Write a structure and sequence with these properties.
aminoacyl-tRNA deacylase activity, six-stranded mixed sheet, 23 helices, binds zinc ion, 35% helix, Leu-tRNA-ligase, alpha+beta, Isoleucyl-tRNA Synthetase, Domain 1, binds magnesium ion
Length: 808
């Protein structure tokens, strides 16, 4: 054993030992309890970033911990390979997206290997290989013939200068983000998952996920947005019927979740596209401009609530079916066509959005709910105005004194008796649009035939292979310009036909990859029956916050679809969720000769407090998430090159709890490294003073007080570490506990025969308690202390007798 810790001299050997023993290559072995620990697989962008290293170290700790506790652990790794960055890199570097992607996979796989993650690499998948995406094409065709996938016209944002479609997040003030050209609203046929057929199941089955964070479930519930409400029809006044036809000339239909407040409605609001808006706008240019602006907006969903609410009166009136009030119709930008009837009633006194709308336009506010003796102020919103539980009806004639549910049913009865309304359930959930006008994604397995229509590709002819000899040029998406790809024959009649050229939303690949890991070479289905039955559901899922709502929702949807096809037996894919925190770092800049700032990467400055560009000073600025926005990313490879993998893993687990933001710290990295030196020196000094002995075990009566206190600390530490790994998932406090154990060890005389046995017991436990965090140095130190295989000695046991104190 060398005297000094040299991670370059031990980390390759340790990795080769694990690979040779194949501890991470797992099969469907019913002789051992399974554990499926899954970390969100990476986009092969070119090289790991610090977020990757944090995510997969957290996954590795949990995996290695459960391995030491006797579990058959599958910890798989793969590549979420489709998407825009490969296209972007192709347009910049004149290379093919596939070539760029596979070179990135090869480099990043090496980096992951160098960190010593206990990964079953025989289960590696790459979603851009046809051996993978053929199976989501297969699922598509099966759902398409059932109508769960369907074709329908939808509206997209066309950038005529870049010749491509943009999401609302890539549209700024109505113009494309990169071009600055005004976008054009185009209606084109696209494909959709009928996810709304599964809304009730996707909402109710959340109750099964006892170990999910409550706010993640809450966000799933809000996104599905089930409401139980009331359809209410407002007769159109005789003076307001010009230009209307059909049912729109008889009544205005709305949906409301507060029909108990129908006596307090003071006006109604319709979408820009509602026929009442069209008819009223016919001879009013101000309404035509307002309708045109609503149609031209590109507000993303995540920003819909923060959009300023605006309306225009129409001079058209409708009649409240309960009290006969004539109410004016307004056109408003927050009423969306397609959401229910595209029309709502407004009760400003008891709905805060209506309150602020009415207060802006000085529309009337009518109180119809009372909560105790609380004063109602028509000029100031109070939280109790919206209270649905403790309120009682007022100013409602026949309905006064009723609570929410009784007034709900009485209004239901009144309306139904008049033919003017009925109860109704609605969902905010929209169907899932999967068509993308992009090249580097999974082809959609549809052929368009003028005689046969939209025809699914037969299972025998899957995959529809995406050609990889393609370099996108930025003058439109390549597939629509490649007749050698889209020109084909109809699989139903043999006549001339054309393949669909749109590709699939890349969320599809990540909605089932965790099943594919169970049998990644299986050629007869998405996943083999034996492997799905054994592995079941993911026991632990570790990932980030970005896109989590949709990804979780989509993966739960796909599970229910795959279960209904007889491919899996679980209703839910993920039993536990750990969302890791972002990694943040300081930023640095120098001012421009053009009134702006040039952002400097931390690897290109030296800190004297103050900074200098590698030699004039730079400005040290604020701390924020590492990104290319302000060029403050720290390269994990330089951290590995300078200190080794264990230092990297230890710093990330020590610096903050996994869900907390982790602040980059040079001194913290160095502190992590010095601790590894300490751990190395402690074992080396123990073994230089007499060589290893048998670890103390059994009855400790007759041990000195100081050695009993060390064994108390020892088995108290083991209990704490076990609860931190297995229950709290708080690895930083577990590292500190082992540090406190080593401190007590340092202050304890262990030179006696019983002392050496306790010391051996202390060090044998500590190296095993830390093996999930820093396995290379711990594997190396364990073999100097004990001849058994560490993974067969297993997780350290708590000696409860070491914790019982001597009575008085
Ligand atoms: Mg349960
Ligand atoms: Zn045909």
């Amino acid at each position: 054993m060398q005297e000094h810790y040299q991670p370059a001299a031990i980390e390759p050997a340790a990795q080769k030992k694990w690979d040779d023993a194949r501890i991470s290559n797992v099969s469907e072995d019913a002789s051992k309890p399974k554990y499926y620990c899954l970390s969100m697989f990476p986009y092969p962008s070119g090289k790991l970033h610090m977020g990757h290293v944090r995510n997969y170290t957290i996954g590795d700790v949990l995996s290695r911990f459960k391995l030491l506790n006797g579990f058959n652990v599958m910890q798989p790794m793969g590549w979420d390979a489709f998407g825009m960055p490969a296209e972007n890199a192709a347009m910049k570097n004149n290379v093919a997206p596939a070539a760029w992607t596979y070179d990135n996979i090869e480099y990043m796989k090496t980096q992951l290997k160098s960190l010593g993650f206990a990964v079953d690499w025989e289960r590696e998948v790459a979603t851009c290989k046809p051996e993978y995406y053929r199976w989501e094409q297969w699922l598509f065709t099966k759902l398409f013939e059932k109508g769960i996938v369907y074709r329908k016209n939808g509206t997209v944002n066309w950038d005529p200068v870049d010749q491509t479609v943009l999401a609302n997040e890539q549209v700024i003030d109505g113009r494309g983000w990169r071009s600055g050209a005004l976008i054009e609203k185009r209606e084109i046929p696209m494909y959709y998952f009928k996810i709304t057929d599964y809304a009730e199941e996707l909402l109710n089955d959340l109750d099964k996920l006892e170990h999910w964070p409550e706010q993640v479930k809450t966000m799933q519930r809000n996104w599905i947005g089930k409401s139980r409400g009331m359809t209410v029809r407002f007769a159109v006044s005789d003076d307001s019927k010009q230009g209307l036809e059909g049912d729109y000339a008889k009544f205005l239909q709305v949906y409301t979740t507060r029909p108990d407040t129908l006596m307090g409605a003071t006006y109604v609001a319709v979408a820009a596209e509602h026929p009442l808006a069209t008819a009223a706008a016919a001879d009013k240019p101000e309404l035509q401009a307002f309708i045109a602006e609503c149609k031209a907006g590109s507000v993303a969903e995540a920003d819909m609530a923060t959009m300023e609410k605006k309306g225009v009166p129409t001079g058209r009136y409708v009649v409240n079916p309960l009290n006969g009030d004539k109410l004016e119709v307004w056109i408003a930008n927050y009423v969306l066509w397609g959401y229910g009837d595209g029309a709502v009633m407004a009760v400003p006194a008891h709905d805060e959005r209506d309150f602020e709308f009415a207060a802006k336009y000085n529309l009337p506010k009518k109180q119809v709910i009372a909560v105790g003796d609380n004063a109602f102020d028509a000029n100031r919103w109070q939280e109790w105005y919206g209270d649905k539980e403790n309120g009682v009806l007022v100013n409602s004639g026949d309905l006064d004194g009723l609570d929410f549910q009784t007034a709900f049913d009485a209004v239901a009865a009144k309306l139904q008796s008049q033919g003017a309304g009925e109860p109704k359930t609605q969902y905010r959930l929209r169907d899932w649009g999967i068509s993308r006008q992009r090249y580097w994604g999974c082809p959609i397995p549809i052929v368009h035939c003028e005689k046969c229509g939209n025809v699914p590709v037969p299972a025998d002819q899957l995959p529809v292979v995406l050609p990889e000899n393609v370099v996108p040029d930025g003058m439109g998406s390549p597939l629509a310009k490649m007749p050698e790809f889209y020109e084909t024959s109809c699989p139903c009649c043999g006549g001339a036909a054309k393949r669909e050229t749109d590709t699939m939303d890349t969320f599809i690949e990540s909605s089932w990859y965790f099943f594919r890991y169970m049998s990644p070479k299986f050629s007869d289905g998405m996943v083999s029956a034996e492997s799905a039955k054994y592995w079941g559901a993911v026991d632990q899922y570790i990932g980030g916050i970005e896109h989590a709502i949709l990804h979780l929702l989509y993966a739960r949807f796909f599970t229910k679809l795959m279960r209904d096809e007889g491919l899996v037996n679980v209703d839910e894919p993920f039993e536990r969720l750990l969302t890791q925190g972002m990694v943040v770092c300081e930023t640095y800049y120098r001012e421009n000769d053009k009134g702006g700032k040039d952002w400097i990467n931390p690897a290109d400055v030296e800190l004297t407090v103050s900074a200098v560009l590698k030699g004039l000073p730079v400005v040290i600025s604020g701390t924020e998430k590492m990104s290319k926005s302000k060029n403050n990313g720290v390269d994990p490879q330089e951290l590995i090159n300078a200190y080794g993998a264990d230092t990297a893993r230890l710093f990330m687990m020590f610096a903050a709890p996994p869900e907390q933001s982790l602040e980059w710290s040079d001194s913290g990295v160095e502190g992590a490294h010095r601790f590894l030196r300490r751990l190395w020196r402690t074992v080396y000094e123990y073994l230089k003073q007499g060589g290893a002995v048998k670890a103390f075990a059994g009855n400790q009566d007759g041990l000195s007080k100081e050695l009993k206190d060390l064994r108390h600390k020892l088995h108290s530490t083991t209990a704490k570490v076990s609860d931190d790994y297995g229950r709290r998932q708080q690895f930083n406090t577990a590292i500190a506990a082992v540090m406190e154990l080593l401190n007590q060890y340092d202050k304890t005389d262990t030179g006696s025969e019983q002392g050496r046995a306790v010391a051996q017991e202390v060090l044998e436990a500590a190296v095993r308690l830390l093996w999930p965090i820093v396995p290379h140095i711990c594997e190396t130190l364990w073999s100097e202390l004990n001849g058994a295989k560490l993974w067969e000695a297993g997780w350290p046991t708590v000696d409860e007798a070491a914790l019982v104190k001597s009575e008085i």
